[PDB]
């Protein structure tokens, strides 16, 4: 094994790699969500970047996990990326729910890995997640919640008009 | 014939001139569309420039075709410009459909001329269309598609209110 | 089908999607190659970015293909991404060969798609590849060839010392 | 005892002081390593600063521990500093191994102190180590690993020439 490796469990090594996959899968889902909203028959530019900036961020989470894996003396193993769960994503509201659900899944994987870190007494891993992931994921889920409430409130009245306003007035383009 | 002319078919020369007419007719349609939306009883400033910047662009396509005709040793022949197909253009939605249809017609004329170029083995003509027209026309038709989807979605709910918002929030003024 | 779609074959639509997969797979291979060279027991910073800037570029090819798919009125379908072909990538020389091979495969897929475009008489697609992919891929394969020759020449003499010099003096960090 | 002291165990107080000694001993080792490489018969300027900037950093760790000790209401007790383990440090490779070993020892002392913090329920101490030491030590050990791999690879071929290149091309001066 590695010349540098110290207090780094094979369990955590393996779980970090699983987390890289989850983050890359999420990035790929957000690409699919992104380009869906760029379809001529959907055409909500604002929604399209929202999900495309999110694709960038999850790819950055996975790249951060990989950097760390190497820093600890673990060995990145890449697995197949399954495709996003859907080919069409519905309304902005349908999409934003799916994202929340996606993000809650990533968050739980994060919490599952803290718990493993604590069980393994790996304080660098705990710190790593606390500094770079836990806080950013809580903030993101909140913002998605906030979007969900606004979209729900708008599209309850007039669906399509509600969709347009939200994209125009909340989301950037 | 011309001192410069080389690999330039009479077929393509003639088809280039037909294309100039089509581009000038389109420019004239976009002028009519433009000033229609500046009527006091229509008054959608945003829609008015959208079509007026498009009148400029098609006049620029025809001027570009004419420059090229001369560059190849062809001889520009101008024909009568028939007037736009309508005197009143309806709603923003009616207007934007007509534009798509107009632009699809121009696009097909472009594709018809590539095919002629290939048949004639005129690689400068093919290149000319690829560099200055094909890509710009695809991008434009997409944007019109995108506008159509947004207008449809808005005016399905509340027609007039939908028209106002689109003009205010999507189109520039 | 789409309101914008014009001269866009289902064959090309499908082949564009296959090309997105190939570009995403390549991006994923270059991530694996990248982080391999960041291992403490490999530690060639220069090689690591070379492959990481390449991961970025192929993700940009796939994003460009997706933008276009939408511009034409096609519908992006995403498939599973198979994992990179190897878990360990050997020497810089082993790695750089694999990249050439990867890039030649992408290039052939590109050439296969031009040919399809020509068969379908889709001049926007041909242009699209010519402008954004064909030239960039030829330039890249050349540079990889150039690296291969330099690495071969260095490591023939002294392997490890040759590897260090190449990374230090040719590649950036 | 102190007017400020709160949730601060005598165990941790004592262990913090032991950690100050370890950091000062390390600083002193890096001074000895530093000036060894400045000998006229060794003369690797690059290696000399590498170890001298490290002497500064460990003195900064100990000063940071002392500031904290005071912040918590502990009382710094200083003990004798034993001299570095060697008078001559061999090659760059011999030196860089010794450093890794030194740094791994400091790292384990850090991990031993987190564990004590957790046992004592001292969350400020845990945080303190996580924020200022754990991450910096992991990053440093990685870089030493990376240097070790490069030095090994160079000096396997030609020892002295390998030493010169590494100092010239990796290390700063
Ligand atoms: Au922990
Ligand atoms: Au944790
Ligand atoms: Au041609
Ligand atoms: Au053509
Ligand atoms: Au073609
Ligand atoms: Au082609
Ligand atoms: Au604690
Ligand atoms: Au801790
Ligand atoms: Cl923790
Ligand atoms: Cl051509
Ligand atoms: Cl072509
Ligand atoms: Cl903690």
Short mmCIF file of C-alpha atoms in Angstrom, two decimals, chain D residues 1 12 20 24 31 50-51 57 62 70 94 107 116-117 129 135 143 147 159 165 172:
data_model
loop_
_atom_site.label_atom_id
_atom_site.label_comp_id
_atom_site.label_asym_id
_atom_site.label_seq_id
_atom_site.Cartn_x
_atom_site.Cartn_y
_atom_site.Cartn_z
CA UNK D 1 -7.24 27.79 38.28
CA UNK D 12 -5.67 17.83 26.94
CA UNK D 20 4.30 21.91 21.36
CA UNK D 24 9.56 22.46 18.21
CA UNK D 31 16.80 23.43 10.63
CA UNK D 50 12.46 23.28 1.28
CA UNK D 51 13.49 22.16 4.78
CA UNK D 57 5.94 26.11 9.53
CA UNK D 62 3.90 25.32 18.04
CA UNK D 70 -3.57 30.52 26.65
CA UNK D 94 17.37 9.77 2.55
CA UNK D 107 0.26 13.51 12.23
CA UNK D 116 -8.52 12.57 23.42
CA UNK D 117 -10.65 15.63 22.60
CA UNK D 129 -7.00 20.76 15.07
CA UNK D 135 -5.71 19.30 6.55
CA UNK D 143 3.63 16.46 -1.41
CA UNK D 147 8.75 14.26 -4.08
CA UNK D 159 21.91 9.18 -8.75
CA UNK D 165 17.61 17.79 -11.86
CA UNK D 172 12.53 26.56 -5.62
#
